Design an enzyme around this catalytic site. Sequence first.
Site, PDB file in Angstrom:
ATOM      1  N   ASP A  47       0.868  -1.169   0.000  1.00  0.00           N
ATOM      2  CA  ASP A  47       0.000   0.000   0.000  1.00  0.00           C
ATOM      3  C   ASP A  47       0.900   1.212   0.000  1.00  0.00           C
ATOM      4  O   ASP A  47       1.554   1.492   1.014  1.00  0.00           O
ATOM      5  CB  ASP A  47      -0.906  -0.011   1.246  1.00  0.00           C
ATOM      6  CG  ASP A  47      -1.688   1.317   1.472  1.00  0.00           C
ATOM      7  OD1 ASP A  47      -1.942   2.087   0.529  1.00  0.00           O
ATOM      8  OD2 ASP A  47      -2.089   1.547   2.639  1.00  0.00           O
ATOM      9  N   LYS A  79       2.310  11.315  -4.182  1.00  0.00           N
ATOM     10  CA  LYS A  79       1.159  10.640  -4.769  1.00  0.00           C
ATOM     11  C   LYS A  79       0.159  11.627  -5.422  1.00  0.00           C
ATOM     12  O   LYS A  79      -0.589  11.247  -6.348  1.00  0.00           O
ATOM     13  CB  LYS A  79       0.458   9.787  -3.707  1.00  0.00           C
ATOM     14  CG  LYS A  79      -0.541   8.768  -4.266  1.00  0.00           C
ATOM     15  CD  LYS A  79      -1.044   7.798  -3.120  1.00  0.00           C
ATOM     16  CE  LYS A  79      -2.135   6.832  -3.591  1.00  0.00           C
ATOM     17  NZ  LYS A  79      -2.588   5.951  -2.445  1.00  0.00           N
ATOM     18  N   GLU A  84      -7.315   0.108  -4.382  1.00  0.00           N
ATOM     19  CA  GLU A  84      -7.280   0.053  -2.912  1.00  0.00           C
ATOM     20  C   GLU A  84      -8.551  -0.562  -2.268  1.00  0.00           C
ATOM     21  O   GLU A  84      -8.430  -1.462  -1.420  1.00  0.00           O
ATOM     22  CB  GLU A  84      -6.996   1.462  -2.320  1.00  0.00           C
ATOM     23  CG  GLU A  84      -5.539   1.866  -2.511  1.00  0.00           C
ATOM     24  CD  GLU A  84      -5.234   3.358  -2.551  1.00  0.00           C
ATOM     25  OE1 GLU A  84      -4.061   3.667  -2.910  1.00  0.00           O
ATOM     26  OE2 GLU A  84      -6.112   4.200  -2.233  1.00  0.00           O
ATOM     27  N   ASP A 120     -12.976   4.794   3.802  1.00  0.00           N
ATOM     28  CA  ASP A 120     -11.519   4.920   3.916  1.00  0.00           C
ATOM     29  C   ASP A 120     -11.150   6.375   4.218  1.00  0.00           C
ATOM     30  O   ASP A 120     -11.321   7.253   3.387  1.00  0.00           O
ATOM     31  CB  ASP A 120     -10.854   4.420   2.620  1.00  0.00           C
ATOM     32  CG  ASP A 120      -9.328   4.289   2.731  1.00  0.00           C
ATOM     33  OD1 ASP A 120      -8.733   4.792   3.719  1.00  0.00           O
ATOM     34  OD2 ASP A 120      -8.733   3.706   1.781  1.00  0.00           O
TER      35      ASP A 120
HETATM   36  N1  LIG Z   1      -5.039   5.216  16.436  1.00  0.00           N
HETATM   37  C1  LIG Z   1      -5.223   6.240  15.603  1.00  0.00           C
HETATM   38  N2  LIG Z   1      -6.197   7.147  15.828  1.00  0.00           N
HETATM   39  C2  LIG Z   1      -6.394   8.192  15.021  1.00  0.00           C
HETATM   40  N3  LIG Z   1      -5.661   8.411  13.930  1.00  0.00           N
HETATM   41  C3  LIG Z   1      -4.670   7.553  13.578  1.00  0.00           C
HETATM   42  C4  LIG Z   1      -4.393   6.373  14.398  1.00  0.00           C
HETATM   43  N4  LIG Z   1      -3.361   5.707  13.816  1.00  0.00           N
HETATM   44  C5  LIG Z   1      -3.025   6.412  12.694  1.00  0.00           C
HETATM   45  N5  LIG Z   1      -3.814   7.493  12.554  1.00  0.00           N
HETATM   46  C6  LIG Z   1      -3.778   8.485  11.476  1.00  0.00           C
HETATM   47  O1  LIG Z   1      -4.022   7.823  10.224  1.00  0.00           O
HETATM   48  C7  LIG Z   1      -3.481   8.684   9.213  1.00  0.00           C
HETATM   49  C8  LIG Z   1      -2.733   7.821   8.211  1.00  0.00           C
HETATM   50  O2  LIG Z   1      -3.620   6.798   7.752  1.00  0.00           O
HETATM   51  P1  LIG Z   1      -3.202   5.759   6.604  1.00  0.00           P
HETATM   52  O3  LIG Z   1      -2.065   4.930   7.168  1.00  0.00           O
HETATM   53  O4  LIG Z   1      -4.501   5.112   6.180  1.00  0.00           O
HETATM   54  O5  LIG Z   1      -2.631   6.712   5.436  1.00  0.00           O
HETATM   55  P2  LIG Z   1      -2.633   6.519   3.828  1.00  0.00           P
HETATM   56  O6  LIG Z   1      -2.762   5.043   3.484  1.00  0.00           O
HETATM   57  O7  LIG Z   1      -1.426   7.285   3.283  1.00  0.00           O
HETATM   58  O8  LIG Z   1      -3.941   7.305   3.332  1.00  0.00           O
HETATM   59  P3  LIG Z   1      -3.991   8.705   2.460  1.00  0.00           P
HETATM   60  O9  LIG Z   1      -3.414   8.405   1.099  1.00  0.00           O
HETATM   61  O10 LIG Z   1      -5.463   9.016   2.473  1.00  0.00           O
HETATM   62  O11 LIG Z   1      -3.183   9.671   3.322  1.00  0.00           O
HETATM   63  C9  LIG Z   1      -2.618   9.748   9.909  1.00  0.00           C
HETATM   64  O12 LIG Z   1      -3.282  11.020   9.845  1.00  0.00           O
HETATM   65  C10 LIG Z   1      -2.437   9.223  11.319  1.00  0.00           C
HETATM   66  O13 LIG Z   1      -2.180  10.143  12.376  1.00  0.00           O
HETATM   67 MG   LIG Z   2      -5.377   5.091  -0.009  1.00  0.00          MG
HETATM   68 NA    NA Z   3      -1.242   3.460   3.739  1.00  0.00          NA
END
Ligand SMILES: Nc1ncnc2c1ncn2[C@@H]1O[C@H](COP(=O)(O)OP(=O)(O)OP(=O)(O)O)[C@@H](O)[C@H]1O
Ligand SMILES: [Mg+2]
Ligand code: NA
Length: 378
Positions: free
Chosen positions: A7, A68, A172, A196
């Site tokens: 991912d 991205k 995704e 999501d």
């Molecule tokens: N326990 C938690 N409670 C609240 N927020 C959280 C927790 N763990 C992680 N996050 C938040 O989740 C976010 C990242 O999510 P994710 O890992 O889904 O990112 P991603 O896959 O890059 O998605 P996008 O491309 O939408 O940014 C951050 O803003 C982070 O602070």
């Molecule tokens: Mg995503």
């Molecule tokens: Na991610």
Amino acid sequence: AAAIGIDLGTTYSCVGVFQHGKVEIIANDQGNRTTPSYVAFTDTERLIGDAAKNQVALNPQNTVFDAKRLIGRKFGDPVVQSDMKHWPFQVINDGDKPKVQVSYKGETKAFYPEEISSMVLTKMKEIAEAYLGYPVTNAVITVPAYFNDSQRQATKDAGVIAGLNVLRIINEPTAAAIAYGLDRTGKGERNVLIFDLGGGTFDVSILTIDDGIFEVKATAGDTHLGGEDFDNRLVNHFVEEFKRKHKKDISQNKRAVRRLRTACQRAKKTLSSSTQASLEIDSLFEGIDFYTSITRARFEELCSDLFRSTLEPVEKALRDAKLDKAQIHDLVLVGGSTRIPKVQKLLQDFFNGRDLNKSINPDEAVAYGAAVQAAILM
Ligand SMILES: Nc1ncnc2c1ncn2[C@@H]1O[C@H](COP(=O)(O)OP(=O)(O)OP(=O)(O)O)[C@@H](O)[C@H]1O
Ligand SMILES: [Mg+2]
Ligand code: NA
Ligand SMILES: [Cl-]
Ligand SMILES: [Cl-]
């Protein structure tokens, strides 16, 4: 040799592998099960992931993130032109393709987005290789459903640059559905809603699955709504608290604000499993310590409009799919921000008390599914 699932997130990336009958989500060298999609250039080294994000002397002009948002787009794309206004790093035009420009070892250099993303993918590949103890050469990589041919191509190219044979690019939301074994249903339609909420973006997807075949029925959401927006609410709150208490404005001190923002992200996560968090920063501004706390209830108030705003895109997706609430068979939580209890409550209430699928850490579900599908294809 096993293939991996990756991912490649806007803000955090995750890697898993299927072996011995089960998926392993692989923790990085610091013990973190997801890694920041960050790359930094200094006078001496290139840093990726945690090391890039966590710089003690972070240089905003030379620390790249959000690639991205650029990948597979033209320089003249209005999305690019808009996004450029709020980044601290420079974007330049090379034949109507964007490049990120930085200083490295003293000299000015520029990189295509798929080059920056290949560095993140190389980190994820290496994280996997350490765990497996052998080289990895095949992967499945995921993208958003709304990605076009050029964006999918540039993502695949990031994989090739990182030394990976990309078995497949998959959506995704489809990957999250695979993680929960929803592709294994026989003949007969089942409607699945993927909700999501990550770091930067919010994606609602409605999938129909029929005897293992996926159809995307509807998509909705907001590419500028995610956890970082909740971070910013906390930062503004505490900047006002510091003013009140110390009669000083810290808002124009870029370092104080970054250090406050990091601490806000840590507190926020803590508030998903505890009803309060302590926030304590040594010498935040002009030698003043900032030791305070925040409750879950207060955090909820600060973000209430943002949390509530996630539901109208669900309504829209349902209209577009020509489906009623009651016709959704499965609801799947994806993205780190769906760990927030208040967000879970809003979506559950909206669906009149339905179960949420949340047994897989939501910020890992996409990599989990990607890993499953990579093993099938091998
Ligand atoms: N326990 C938690 N409670 C609240 N927020 C959280 C927790 N763990 C992680 N996050 C938040 O989740 C976010 C990242 O999510 P994710 O890992 O889904 O990112 P991603 O896959 O890059 O998605 P996008 O491309 O939408 O940014 C951050 O803003 C982070 O602070
Ligand atoms: Mg995503
Ligand atoms: Na991610
Ligand atoms: Cl690491
Ligand atoms: Cl590194």
